[PDB]
């Protein structure tokens, strides 16, 4: 947290901005409150805070858990999409329904993405995620 960066608590220009900090929304405490919420980080001569990313508990949670949340949701959406696609093909109405979504079937697949990570891990160990270099017949060259 070095590099010549003053704490946002005691950076004079920080509170100087905080004084007439333009309260954005329809509540008078909007601006001031957020500046109060910006005492944990450490400002600089620009008067605005920089973010440190190291796992260092000074700013660890301020970047780690959002990353993990994104991984959660991206895994969910990718998993349910792939599962839906795999399911459609066992109907022999393939491209008919490619544009007409079968809602009574599209729902439970979406609702059943609860345990995507570890299940995916299983498909990794079972090897249920990849087809074989030559079995996949998509010809290169």
């Amino acid at each position: 947290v070095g590099a010549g960066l003053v704490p946002c608590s005691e950076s004079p220009e920080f509170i100087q901005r905080a004084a007439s900090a333009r309260n954005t929304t329809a509540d008078p405490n909007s601006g001031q409150k957020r500046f109060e919420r910006y005492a944990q980080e450490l400002c600089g001569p620009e008067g605005l805070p920089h973010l440190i990313v190291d796992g260092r508990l000074n700013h660890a949670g301020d970047f780690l858990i959002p990353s993990i949340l994104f991984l959660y949701i991206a895994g969910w959406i990718g998993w349910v999409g792939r599962a839906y696609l795999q399911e459609i093909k066992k109907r022999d109405n393939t491209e008919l329904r490619e544009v007409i979504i079968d809602v009574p079937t599209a729902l439970p697949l979406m609702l059943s993405g609860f345990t995507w990570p570890l299940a995916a891990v299983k498909e990794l160990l079972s090897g249920e995620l990849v087809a074989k270099d030559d079995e996949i017949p998509v010809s290169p060259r």
């Binding site: 333009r22 954005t24 929304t25 329809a26 999409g81 792939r82 696609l85 795999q86 459609i88 093909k89 393939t94 491209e95 008919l96 490619e98 544009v99 007409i100 995620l129 990849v130 087809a131 996949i136 998509v138 290169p140």
Partner: protein
Amino acid sequence: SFEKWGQPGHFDRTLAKGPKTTTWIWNLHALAHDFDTHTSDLEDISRKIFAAHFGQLAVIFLWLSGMEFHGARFSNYEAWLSDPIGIKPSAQVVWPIVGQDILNADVGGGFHGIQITSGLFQVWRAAGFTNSFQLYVTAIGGLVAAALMLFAGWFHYHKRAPKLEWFQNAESMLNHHLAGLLGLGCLSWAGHQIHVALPVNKLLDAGVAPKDIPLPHEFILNNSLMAELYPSFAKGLTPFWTLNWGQYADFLTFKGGLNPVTGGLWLTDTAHHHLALAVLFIVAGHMYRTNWGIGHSIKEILENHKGPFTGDGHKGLYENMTTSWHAQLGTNLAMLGSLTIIVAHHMYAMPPYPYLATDYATALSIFTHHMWIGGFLIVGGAAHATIFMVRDYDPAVNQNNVLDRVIRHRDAIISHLNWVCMFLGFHSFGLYIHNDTMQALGRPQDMFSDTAIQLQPVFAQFVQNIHTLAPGSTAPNALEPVSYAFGGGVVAVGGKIAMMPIALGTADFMIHHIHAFQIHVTVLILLKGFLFARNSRLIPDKANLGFRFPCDGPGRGGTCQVSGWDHVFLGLFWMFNTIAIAVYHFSWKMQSDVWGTIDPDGTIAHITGGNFAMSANTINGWLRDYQWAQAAQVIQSYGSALSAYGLLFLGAHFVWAFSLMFLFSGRGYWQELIESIVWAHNKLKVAPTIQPRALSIIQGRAVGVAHYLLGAIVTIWAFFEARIISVG
């Protein structure tokens, strides 16, 4: 009765089966309307056109009534009523959430929102609008009429549809429309004017208690107040029964000029105008032959006009004008376009509404809007002319006619045309850059303005002059000149100019000449595609093959871009240039020596200071002395309450470069990249069944030109919008 929509491709037999690849999507949005490409029958076509017209009218009514309603509940009209100067109209109040809260366009009286520029209140300063409830009723009427005529379209298509001979009575068409539509509507509007408009206009001279001013019902049968003014308007004295019209000199007069108490002209002139037009084209539209065995046999008129150079004249032209549709489409589009641009080129010297020349924001917005639409659609008129040429013609009914007589000697025409274009082009631009070099070369005596080598457009000066002293002799029963840019006195109000005479010195010459230059080359491209549409000196199968196709292989070297709509591509690029520099010229002059402020001596202190006589002669000056002013605030024009609208000019450049990306590149490259990504996806078992395929080269060209135009026009409107906000 809802079992029918979700059966796509209902109109085409080919794409109705199924979406093999993504291509099936694209054509879905491409052939949804050209139902001439569906059968050979015509009654169906006509019925579809009727219903589509009704739908367009319905959306018209909807949007106008909704805009009213916004004007009634969220617009500072009735406060801006009492003061049209110290208040700037607005609408579309900002919604108070994160992101749009600082954008409160406060225009006095605490009314926040969005400071609009479309001058509807100006109409609402002539229509005499007091309370918003009547306006509420107006919107209700508009929307119910919309729904009504939409239902009418449904009925006239699904229950009782018209027959086929109902089409080609152009005679009754012209008669009914010309007379009944135009004359009756115009005379009805004039009657509304005289009854209500000028009365409340009178009543808007000194603060005469607007809402307290009576309602029209207090004047339907109450002639007392109607007898206050205009003694002849007791009832009317009805001297028309006695054929005497001298009594009516009260309201139905002829002034012809600026009325410095209204910000516009004298409305009585407009009323008598509308009267005269009404009866004039009523008796006009009573011309052609119809069901009473009396009139012109119009297909014989064109038979008569022939002669030595004519060949056989205008023989055989109606099969074209009625059997085919694209013909009519193209010609009417061209005419409308021209008409619209003259309208634009017209209503900045004769403002027909109250508070127009005194309101320096709505003027150029309206002007440029209409001007852009004009060209933007006349090119389409020419395109439909070409599509007629490829779709509809006849070798039999077109023997030696004035039509065929050009398609036989096209080469001479177009060669001489190219000659003219080259001549004018460098004769103007190379002259310009010559003077550029001279100024950069310490040889200033070789410049071309008044202070140097001479040239003066005497013709415009003399025509303006002979226009200056028109009244008295040419116009005895006329009081003032038609305008004040030709001649007369500098008419104004406050410290704010309304109209002064315009000066044409040296810089006018090359500007008008390059205008003509670009128009010439535009005609060149378009007419070239027109004539060389069916057969070229190398491609004798064009019409035998179509008019929308990319190329004909690398024969004869290259042949890519040999269709016609690529000709109109190049043409639309060129017309973009034309209209862009045209609006540049107009804005700069009418902000340089026409508009500014005024002192008690009538001293017009213009905005810029007459910069054409100083810099509008060399290129480097043209960038300096125009866009320095046109942007020096947009950089900082953001950052407060009535500034926060960070404009998407910074944003439009991106779409422009993204545009030009599509132009310079082929497609096989993208196809191969697509195939590689497909390989990867197939390796991870996510291969999309519908196999993606890259765009077709014509599709890519179209999206490129579309994005190009969009970015450019967005950029420029952002420019002068913020520029007027800096002064208005």
